[PDB]
Short mmCIF file of C-alpha atoms and ligand atoms in Angstrom, two decimals:
data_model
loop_
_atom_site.label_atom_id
_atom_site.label_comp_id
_atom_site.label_asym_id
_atom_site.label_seq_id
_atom_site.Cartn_x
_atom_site.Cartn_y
_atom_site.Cartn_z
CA UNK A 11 25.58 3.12 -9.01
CA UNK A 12 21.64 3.80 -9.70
CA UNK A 13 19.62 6.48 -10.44
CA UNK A 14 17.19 7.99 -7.53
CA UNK A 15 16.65 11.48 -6.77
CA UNK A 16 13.17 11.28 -5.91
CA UNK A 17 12.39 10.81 -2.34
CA UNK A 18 8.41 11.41 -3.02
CA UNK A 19 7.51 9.38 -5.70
CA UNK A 20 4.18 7.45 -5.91
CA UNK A 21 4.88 4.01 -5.49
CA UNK A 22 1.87 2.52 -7.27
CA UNK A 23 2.68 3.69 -10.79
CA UNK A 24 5.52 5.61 -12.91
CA UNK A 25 4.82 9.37 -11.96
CA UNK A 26 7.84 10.53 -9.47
CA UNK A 27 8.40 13.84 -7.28
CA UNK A 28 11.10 15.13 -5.07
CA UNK A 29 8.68 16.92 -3.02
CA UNK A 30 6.02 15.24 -0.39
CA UNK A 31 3.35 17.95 -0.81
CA UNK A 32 3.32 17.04 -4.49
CA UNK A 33 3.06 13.50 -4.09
CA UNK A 34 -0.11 13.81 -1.84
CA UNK A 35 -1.31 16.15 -4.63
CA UNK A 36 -0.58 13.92 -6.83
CA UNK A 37 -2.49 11.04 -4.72
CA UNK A 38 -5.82 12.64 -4.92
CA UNK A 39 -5.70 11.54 -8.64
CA UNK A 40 -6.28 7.59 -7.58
CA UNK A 41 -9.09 8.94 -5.43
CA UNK A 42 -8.88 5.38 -2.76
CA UNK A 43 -7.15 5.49 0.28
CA UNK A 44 -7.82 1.88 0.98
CA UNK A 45 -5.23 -0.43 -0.76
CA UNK A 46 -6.53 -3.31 0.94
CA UNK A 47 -10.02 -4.22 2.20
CA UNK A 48 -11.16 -7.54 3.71
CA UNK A 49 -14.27 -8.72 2.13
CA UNK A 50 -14.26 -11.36 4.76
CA UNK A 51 -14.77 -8.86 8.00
CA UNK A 52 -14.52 -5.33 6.02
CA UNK A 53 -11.17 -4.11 7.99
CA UNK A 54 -8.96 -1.53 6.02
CA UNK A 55 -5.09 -1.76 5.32
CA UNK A 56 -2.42 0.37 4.13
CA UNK A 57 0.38 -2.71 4.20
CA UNK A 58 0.05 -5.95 2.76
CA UNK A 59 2.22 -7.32 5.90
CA UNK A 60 -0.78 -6.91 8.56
CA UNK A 61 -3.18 -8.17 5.35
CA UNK A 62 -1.19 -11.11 5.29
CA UNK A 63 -1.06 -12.01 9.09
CA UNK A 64 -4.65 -10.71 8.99
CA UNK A 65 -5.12 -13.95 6.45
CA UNK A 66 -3.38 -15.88 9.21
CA UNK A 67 -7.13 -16.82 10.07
CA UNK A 68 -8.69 -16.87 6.75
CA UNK A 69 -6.14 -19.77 6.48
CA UNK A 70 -8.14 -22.54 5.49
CA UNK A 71 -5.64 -25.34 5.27
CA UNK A 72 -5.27 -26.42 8.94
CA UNK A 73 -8.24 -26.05 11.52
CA UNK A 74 -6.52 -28.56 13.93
ZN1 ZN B 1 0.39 7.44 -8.53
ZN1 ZN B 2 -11.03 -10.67 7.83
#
């Protein structure tokens, strides 16, 4: 057994909801809708997953 009752809760820092139009109010309060940036090319991500296969050529550890 665990607690959870909040479906809509910002999952960048404590603050929880149980309501999705509250939690995008409440996301205007980080004002920056880009998580991820590549300083490399300047491409924008939401997900660390595509960052990460993104890095798949920033790699540096294996040219050939
Ligand atoms: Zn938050
Ligand atoms: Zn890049």
């Amino acid at each position: 057994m665990t607690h959870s009752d909040k479906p809509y809760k910002c999952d960048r820092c404590q603050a929880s909801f149980r309501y999705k139009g509250n939690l995008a109010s409440h996301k205007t309060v980080h004002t920056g809708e880009k998580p991820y940036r590549c300083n490399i090319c300047g491409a924008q991500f939401n997900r660390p997953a595509n960052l990460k296969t993104h890095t798949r050529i920033h790699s540096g550890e294996k040219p050939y």
